[PDB]
Each structure stands twice: as structure tokens, then as C-alpha cells.
């Protein structure tokens, strides 16, 4: 047998193509893209781990049949609350760990088991992580638990925010923070923040610590290159301490 039929899937959408092993896959993915209603480079085609490039064939990537090419949507419109891989999450035991390591670990543990979740723009995985977060009614630092780890495609632009105190985080343009208007603590999306506006941080990264309202001094829009962004979902309080800042889900 020479010709090979792969299943191309965005998690939801699955289309079966059969092509011969010498064919470049340029038009397989161009066809799938048009079937999805978008042009080819708003999508990401992945075999096992590494991302394909258009001018490759089945044999040079060691293909089999019923093999799958997973596609991930490039976010147009931001809309995907998440943060940079290196964002240091503050664990419930006091230590700090980059959220990307946390999420990738959770993802391969979910994959070795049978509960890795897939969405068109990435993956999620069950987790049970004790974090430090802001108590939305006590307004002091508390312990919480995250149940879902999230790994999504990088948006077309991201925002790096740095505060007068010297805290700095790289987040998607929609990622919300805590603000204070008239005595209201509200949440504001990142792109809504203005230079000089104060966002909530922990005064110390210790339990029962109160809020330090930190003046935002730098807001930088930039084209990223990191390929994946990450987040943690924490029920009830919907936030956690990352890079010394209260980041809201």
C-alpha cells in the first residue's frame, strides 16, 4: 500500500483525507483550512509533538494510517485569558514555580491517563494545586485550589505590565486584574488598564497579607514568539498570586 488516509482534527472538527505518501501536505491543510472557513496560517497543524510545515510529506514524518493531525486555532480577537510560560505561580507551600511547567506536567499526566481535554485553540488538564490567592471577601491572602490547567495558543499581541513596585507580568490582552474605583474592587481587563492606574498586589507573599495597590508604570504591547500561553482555573476566588500580582481568571 502506498497512499495513506489521515484524520485532521481541531478537537471538534474531524475531516478524513487520503493522499499518497510522496504528496506534500500543503493542500491537505489548505483544504482543511478552507473547510473551516479560514485561511491556512490562522491554523496550526501538529503531528505528535512538533508542528508540521507545508512542504512535508507522510514518509519523511514517519506516518501511519488512522494517524491524526491535530489543528489549533490562532486567536484572532485575543479573547483567551492566559499568561506567559515563565510567570511564577506562588504555591500553597511558599515556593514559586513557572505556570508553564505546572501546566505541561499536568498535561502529560492527564495524557498518560485518559482525561486530557482538547479545545480548538489548545488543551486543558485536571489538576489539584494549592495556590496562594486573594480572598475576594476577606481581601487578604489565602490558600485556594486550582482544578483546571489551561494551555492555549498565543494571541497575535500580548501585554507586558510593570509596576512602580517593580512587579512585571506578561499576559494576554484580555487577562483581568484587580482595580479600585471609589472603594469598589472591580476587575479590569489588561488592555483597559492605563499607565498610572493601581492594580492589586500582595503586600507580602504570606497568608493574611493585605493588598498593596501598585501603580502600573509600563504597559507594552508586543508581538510574542512563545507559541503557547498558560493559565490555572481556581473556583470560588477566580484568582491567584503570580509574579507578585493578583491575576484574576
Author numbering: 31 to 279
Sentences reproduced from the published study:
We introduced the C1A mutation into the PhoCDC21-1 intein without additional C-extein sequence and fused it to an N-terminal H6-SUMO domain (yeast SMT3) for convenient purification. Interestingly, the three-residue “SGK” linker used between the H6-SUMO and PhoCDC21-1 intein in the fusion protein was too short for efficient cleavage by Ulp1. Thus, we performed crystallization trials with the H6-SUMO-PhoCDC21-1 fusion protein without removal of H6-SUMO domain and were successful in obtaining diffracting crystals. Overall, the crystal structure of the PhoCDC21-1 intein is very similar to that of PabCDC21-1 but includes the SUMO domain as N-extein. The main difference between the two structures is a four-residue loop extension located at the canonical HEN insertion site of the PhoCDC21-1 intein. The 4-residue loop extension in the PhoCDC21-1 intein creates additional interactions, presumably stabilizing the two subdomains further. We observed clear electron densities for the entire SUMO domain in addition to the PhoCDC21-1 intein, except for the 30 N-terminal residues containing the His-tag. To our knowledge, this is the first intein structure with an entire extein domain in addition to the junction regions. The interacting residues at the SUMO/intein interface locate mainly on one subdomain of the PhoCDC21-1 intein (residues 37–42, 71–75, and 146–147). We previously observed that cis-splicing of the PhoCDC21-1 intein strongly depends on the fused exteins when artificial exteins are used—even while maintaining identical junction sequences. The observed extein–intein interactions confirm the structural basis of this extein-context dependency in addition to the well-known junction-sequence dependency common among inteins.
Protein splicing is catalyzed by intervening protein sequences termed inteins. As the first step toward understanding the spread and evolution of inteins and cross-talks within the “inteinome”, we determined the crystal structures of mini-inteins inserted at the same insertion site within the putative cell division control protein 21 (Cdc21) from the hyperthermophilic archaea, Pyrococcus abyssi and Pyrococcus horikoshii OT3. The cell division control protein 21 (Cdc21), belonging to the MCM (mini-chromosome maintenance) protein family, is one of the proteins invaded by several inteins. The structure of the PabCDC21-1 intein revealed the HINT fold characteristic for inteins from thermophilic organisms.
